């Protein structure tokens, strides 16, 4: 009678004349990403910017503005904000710029330096960005190490949200869809919910925990169902404790309502994130450490106006 509340997402045109020093970051299926400065007219603010682009046509537009239309409606410290968009002949999307890249390069990068703690802290903020899509009624649908975002190693959020939807089930008509990720329900029936995004998770940490491995290396997407409806799964990470591996199993059982829950995933994480070692046994651990705020990859004349996305906030 009512379906859903209003979305009183405000949506940010923003002047192609606000944004300074753009140069390309990387190319892939997800399009042309770029790295800038944003620069609010009538505000003393540098913003580092990306900015997306589908590397004009008409679904393209439509497509890319689905995405603005799901990002400007989440606002939450482990998912990325849309800041807004330009109305170039092609649409671009502007977010925070997120200097370390995906954690799926960051884990190959700098596999011999990562400890127990920043890969449970990853787990424990992917699964509250996750819960609060789930609170949104958003799935995902994508959810990989390769959309995960490093603001700085110790801070993650979730990018790419092409393939969200807005949901008790959610049904695809066609499309390439990313199948060494999806929950056997979503590869048989297209049943996306989210506890098909819980099954996503579990894929998540096994890539994180095998420090960049490709789950299912060498079998062809056409396999993997056949493969899982005969039982077999991921195999557990050599750092991984069996607690770690029992948590990403449960992701990965055929009952959807079986699996782990968002906010379950986020209480179990957080309280191996309290023993790292006792849950995870990396050779060398603890005496590594990663970079902090407590900004190299600024041009000196920009340092001193340079803000944060995070610490830029709008009525
Ligand atoms: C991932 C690598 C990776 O993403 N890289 C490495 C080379 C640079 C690039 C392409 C980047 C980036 C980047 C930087 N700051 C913020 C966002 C992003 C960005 N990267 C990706 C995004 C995405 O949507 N899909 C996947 C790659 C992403 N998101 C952006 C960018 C601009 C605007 C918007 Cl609104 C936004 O999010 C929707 C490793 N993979 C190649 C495996
Ligand atoms: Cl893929
Ligand atoms: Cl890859």
């Known amino acids: 009678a009512m379906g859903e509340a209003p979305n009183q997402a405000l949506l940010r045109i923003l002047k192609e004349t606000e944004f300074k020093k753009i140069k390309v970051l990387g190319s892939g299926a997800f399009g042309t990403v770029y790295k800038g400065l944003w620069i609010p007219e009538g505000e003393k ?15 393209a537009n439509k497509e890319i503005l689905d995405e603005a239309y799901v990002m400007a409606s989440v606002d939450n410290p482990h998912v990325c904000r849309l800041l807004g968009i330009c109305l170039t002949s092609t649409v671009q999307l502007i977010t925070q ?16 330096n990562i400890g127990s703690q920043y890969l449970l802290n990853w787990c424990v903020q992917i699964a509250k960005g996750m819960n609060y899509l789930e609170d949104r009624r958003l799935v ?3 959810l990989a190490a ?15 949200f092409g393939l969200a939807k807005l949901l008790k089930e959610y049904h695809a008509e066609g499309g390439k869809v990313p199948i060494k990720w999806m929950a056997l329900e979503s590869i048989l029936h297209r049943i996306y919910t989210h506890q098909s995004d819980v099954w996503s998770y579990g894929v998540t940490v096994w890539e994180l925990m ?9 079998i062809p997407a056409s396999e993997i169902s056949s ?22 199993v449960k992701c ?64």
């Open 227 to 248: 493969i899982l409806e005969k039982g077999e799964r991921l195999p557990q990470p050599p750092i991984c404790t069996i607690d770690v591996y029992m948590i990403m």
């Open 45 to 59: 603010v540098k913003i580092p910017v990306a900015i997306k682009e589908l590397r004009t046509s008409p679904k």
């Open 210 to 218: 095998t420090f960049g491995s490709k789950p299912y290396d060498g």
């Open 97 to 112: 710029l997120m200097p370390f890249g995906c954690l799926l390069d960051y884990v190959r990068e700098h596999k011999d």
């Open 140 to 142: 995902h649908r994508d």
């Open 146 to 160: 390769r959309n995960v975002l490093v603001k700085t190693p110790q801070h993650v959020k979730i990018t790419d």
């Open 252 to 315: 990965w059982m055929i009952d959807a309502d079986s699996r782990p829950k968002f906010r379950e995933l986020i209480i179990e994480f957080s309280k191996m994130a309290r023993d790292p070692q006792r849950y995870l046994v990396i050779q060398g651990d603890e005496r590594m450490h990663l970079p902090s705020p407590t900004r190299a990859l600024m041009d000196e004349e920009d340092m001193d106006d340079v803000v944060d996305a995070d610490e830029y906030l709008i009525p």
